[PDB]
Design an enzyme around this catalytic site. Structure first.
Site, short mmCIF file in Angstrom:
data_model
loop_
_atom_site.label_atom_id
_atom_site.label_comp_id
_atom_site.label_asym_id
_atom_site.label_seq_id
_atom_site.Cartn_x
_atom_site.Cartn_y
_atom_site.Cartn_z
N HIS A 104 54.99 52.49 69.72
CA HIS A 104 54.66 52.21 70.95
C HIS A 104 54.71 50.76 71.19
O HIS A 104 54.74 50.32 72.24
CB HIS A 104 53.67 53.05 71.77
CG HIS A 104 52.33 52.64 71.35
ND1 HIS A 104 51.40 53.27 70.64
CD2 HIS A 104 51.74 51.48 71.90
CE1 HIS A 104 50.31 52.65 70.70
NE2 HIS A 104 50.33 51.39 71.29
N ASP A 139 54.91 58.43 66.81
CA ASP A 139 54.50 57.13 67.21
C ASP A 139 54.36 56.25 65.95
O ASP A 139 53.26 56.13 65.43
CB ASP A 139 53.06 56.81 68.02
CG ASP A 139 52.96 55.78 68.54
OD1 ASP A 139 53.92 54.80 68.53
OD2 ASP A 139 51.71 55.35 69.07
N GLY A 177 44.64 47.07 70.91
CA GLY A 177 44.72 45.96 70.19
C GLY A 177 44.84 46.46 68.62
O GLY A 177 45.06 45.72 67.79
N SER A 203 46.37 49.43 67.70
CA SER A 203 47.43 50.27 67.50
C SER A 203 48.42 49.76 66.31
O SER A 203 48.50 48.58 66.36
CB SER A 203 48.25 50.61 68.74
OG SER A 203 47.63 51.37 69.49
N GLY A 204 48.91 50.38 65.65
CA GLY A 204 49.79 50.21 64.52
C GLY A 204 49.11 50.18 63.03
O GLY A 204 49.71 50.16 62.28
#
Ligand SMILES: CC(C)[C@@H](O)C(=O)NCc1cccc(-n2ncc(-c3cc4cnccc4[nH]3)c2O)c1
Ligand SMILES: [Ca+2]
Ligand SMILES: [Cl-]
Ligand SMILES: [Cl-]
Lengths: 247, 57
Positions: free
Chosen positions: A41, A90, A183, A185-186
């Protein structure tokens, strides 16, 4: 990260910061000298695919200390099953333009074998989540890297205690004190087993952060080991974004 | 068997036909003669934190 602590410099050496035109985009996880795992995303609104940068060895965003290593992102690989603006599948695999140099401050997280991850790591209760995301819901992002210990829930227990698919897991706390946040995410959900750390999840997304009654949602990396490994053996393709069949 | 206690392996575990098991190690590690333990073979093996590994050497 809400309710965590500063990760002492060098203690999260796999953490990646992703930038687009110098601005914070997302986190990621280094798994080899050229390969970073992040969340699909993070790339839903990218216009210029050529201005994505990964930074390794980062700690305090206010200063340059010489441990940082920046690289251009050459390829962003997303599963064919991922639908922009949603949670399922995701995950993204990012190829760097040039390897990073491993140092005391830059070290990959181990990408485990699927069996090990399913049979063993999935039962380790606590794992670490990290990032430069918001310190509070509707709050400012962090300038130093933050880390949080979160406990994992079996999905039946997540649902009862609160869609969560087999490609996700829940972790964290339902009392609004401690979560990953926008902030982050990932970034990595890293699990320790017998002296080594492993990648077991990716910070994904949902409605709010540290929302009472809700747990954090993480991409279940064990589902993607084979997919990842096959891609890491493949040659690069022209054009940054690649959608790759999943499974 | 690999499903119980990771087969006694520090890292990865494969079952074979019989009462047979083989442990394996990630790249950057080698398997010791115990058949279970993994020891780094490079300076910056995956999943270890240099500043903490040097605090305990
Ligand atoms: C509709 C479109 C304009 C807009 O949504 C967009 O920009 N999409 C791309 C894009 C690129 C990077 C981050 C984000 N982005 N937005 C929100 C969150 C997020 C919330 C959250 C809560 N708990 C844990 C992790 C969490 N992450 C997030 O990661 C979106
Ligand atoms: Ca810095
Ligand atoms: Cl190929
Ligand atoms: Cl392009």
């Amino acid at each position: 990260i809400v309710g965590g602590k500063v990760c002492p410099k060098g203690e999260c050496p796999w953490q990646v910061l992703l930038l687009v035109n110098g601005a914070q985009l997302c986190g990621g996880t280094l798994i080899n000298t050229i390969w970073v795992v992040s969340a699909a995303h993070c790339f839903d609104k990218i216009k210029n695919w050529r201005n994505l940068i990964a930074v390794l060895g980062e700690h305090d965003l206010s200063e340059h200390d010489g441990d940082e290593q920046s690289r251009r992102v050459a390829q962003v690989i997303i599963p064919s099953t991922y639908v922009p603006g949603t949670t399922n599948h995701d995950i993204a695999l990012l190829r760097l333009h040039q390897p990073v140099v491993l140092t005391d401050h830059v070290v990959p997280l181990c990408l485990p074998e699927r069996t090990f991850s399913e049979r063993t790591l999935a039962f380790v209760r606590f794992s670490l989540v990290s990032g430069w995301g918001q310190l509070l819901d509707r709050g400012a992002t962090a300038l130093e890297l933050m880390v949080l210990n979160v406990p994992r829930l079996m999905t039946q227990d997540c649902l009862q205690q609160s869609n969560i698919t087999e490609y996700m897991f829940c972790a964290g706390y339902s009392d609004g004190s401690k979560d990953s946040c926008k902030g982050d995410s990932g970034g990595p959900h890293a699990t320790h087993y017998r002296g080594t750390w492993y990648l077991t999840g990716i910070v994904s997304w949902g409605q709010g952060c540290a929302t009472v009654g809700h747990f954090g949602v993480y991409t279940r990396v064990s589902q993607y080991i084979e997919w990842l490994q096959k891609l890491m053996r493949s040659e690069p393709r022209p054009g940054v974004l690649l959608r790759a069949p999943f499974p | 068997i690999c499903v119980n206690e990771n087969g006694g392996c520090e890292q990865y575990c494969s079952d074979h036909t019989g009462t047979k098991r083989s442990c394996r190690c990630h790249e950057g590690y080698s398997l010791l003669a115990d058949g279970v333990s993994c020891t780094p073979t490079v300076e910056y093996p995956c999943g270890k934190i240099p500043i903490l590994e040097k605090r305990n050497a």
